[PDB]
């Protein structure tokens, strides 16, 4: 991603002689013999870069083409999201159809289980949530948003919600079964991800956050627990419990302490910028093997976060420290992803210049680590859990606060 017309300060489809006029203007603004502020020298090369393209008519051709294609991909993506947004899927299955096997993980919401549908013969992963542990949280809202959003979104790195249904005791969400395990387990076991290893994962998140933000969605809970590794070694984001559609600022305090951006901790409001903060924490924890901000208890994590004092390990390249320093920015007018150039500041950073953005999206890059596939329906990249049977009571609980499901 590069935005040549904005560098020169011109509308698309401006006249080549206004492209020349724009260049000679901006070129005078950041000329080394005239301006010496440290950022000017790189905006100078970026103004020269924009002119070398926009004046060569065949290179302005490739660039103007790749742009309408982006415009259509964003407009078709947004189209797909809103139709399924307002026409969501409900009661697309029933628990009798699925044979339960192993608990893949257990969370405050409920269980996630490996299931085989008996007719189709396919394996899936079912998230069971108990309406009685969730109507108490008063975060019926956060679990309603998770259904509406997960159905209705499409991206190579979001997990796909095949079926959803409800009964008297629980809500159910059946999803594509990612078998490589959680990134959490791999990272803890190794202790650390190598810098190229982390960059691969990081890139798919920048692409997912670009997608999700383009749809006015904040994801709000990035952590290794929530990132699963498919068989091609790529990333499936799998937990949307905190994702909300937001215009302006939102205020719920939620997500995971280590990953909470400062502005959430303060009563101040917040927006999609918090996901860019989280990415910095995610990159940090992957490269170091620990997050930049821990303590015995959340309140002291919140304190370390708002201070904006970060320490980096001895390993950690200089470009890594420069990138995190920009992501982990308490100043909302200085944090990459929030500036005028948006995701490009992240896509075009020196820590990423070795990453073919489009090849990531089309999953054509070799993955630094492929899990050992042991045959369909193996659960050995997942920890083993104590199995609690599903009980459905004679009476339907919370039938109202979950009318929409």
């Amino acid at each position: 991603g590069k935005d040549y017309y904005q560098t020169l300060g011109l509308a698309r489809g401006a006249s080549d002689e206004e492209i020349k006029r724009a260049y000679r203007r901006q070129a005078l603004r950041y000329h080394p013999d005239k301006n010496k502020e440290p950022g000017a020298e790189e905006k100078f090369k970026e103004i020269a870069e924009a002119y070398d393209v926009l004046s060569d008519p065949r290179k302005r051709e490739i660039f103007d083409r790749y742009g309408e294609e982006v415009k259509e991909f964003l407009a078709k993506a947004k189209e797909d999201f809103l139709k399924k947004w307002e026409s969501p899927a409900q009661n697309t299955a029933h628990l009798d159809q699925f044979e339960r096997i192993k608990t893949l993980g257990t969370g405050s919401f409920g269980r996630v289980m490996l299931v085989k549908h008996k007719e189709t013969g396919n394996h899936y992963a079912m998230k069971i949530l108990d309406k009685q542990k969730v109507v108490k949280l008063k975060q019926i809202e956060h679990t309603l948003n998770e259904k509406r959003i997960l159905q209705a979104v499409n991206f190579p790195f979001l997990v796909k919600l095949e079926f959803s249904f409800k009964d008297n005791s629980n809500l159910y969400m059946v999803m594509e079964y990612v078998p490589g395990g959680e990134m959490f387990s791999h990272l803890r076991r190794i202790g650390r991800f190598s810098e190229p290893h982390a960059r691969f994962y990081a890139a798919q998140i920048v692409l997912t956050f670009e997608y999700l933000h383009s749809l006015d969605l904040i994801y709000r809970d990035l952590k290794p627990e929530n990132l699963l590794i498919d068989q091609q070694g790529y990333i499936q984001v799998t937990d949307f419990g905190f994702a909300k559609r937001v215009k302006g600022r939102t205020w719920t305090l939620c997500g995971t302490p280590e990953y909470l951006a400062p502005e959430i901790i303060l009563s101040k409001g917040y927006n999609k910028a918090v996901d860019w903060w989280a990415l910095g924490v995610l990159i940090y924890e992957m490269a170091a093997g620990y997050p930049p901000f821990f303590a015995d208890q959340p309140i002291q994590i919140y304190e370390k976060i708002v201070s904006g004092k970060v320490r980096f390990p001895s390993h950690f390249s200089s470009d890594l420290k420069d990138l995190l320093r920009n992501l982990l920015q308490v100043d909302l007018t200085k944090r990459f992803g929030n500036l005028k150039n948006g995701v490009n500041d992240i896509k075009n950073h020196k820590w990423f210049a070795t990453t073919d953005w489009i090849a990531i999206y089309q999953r054509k890059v070799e993955a630094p680590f492929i899990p050992k596939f042991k045959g369909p329906g193996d659960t050995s990249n997942f920890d083993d859990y104590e199995e609690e049977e599903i009980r459905v009571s004679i009476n339907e609980k919370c039938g109202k606060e979950f009318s929409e499901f």
Partner: peptide, 20 residues
Amino acid sequence: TTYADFIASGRTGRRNAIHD
């Protein structure tokens, strides 16, 4: 730095979520 401090913090396993 402080990886052994990370292990002492007891926040090394799967972290739960705030919901306020």
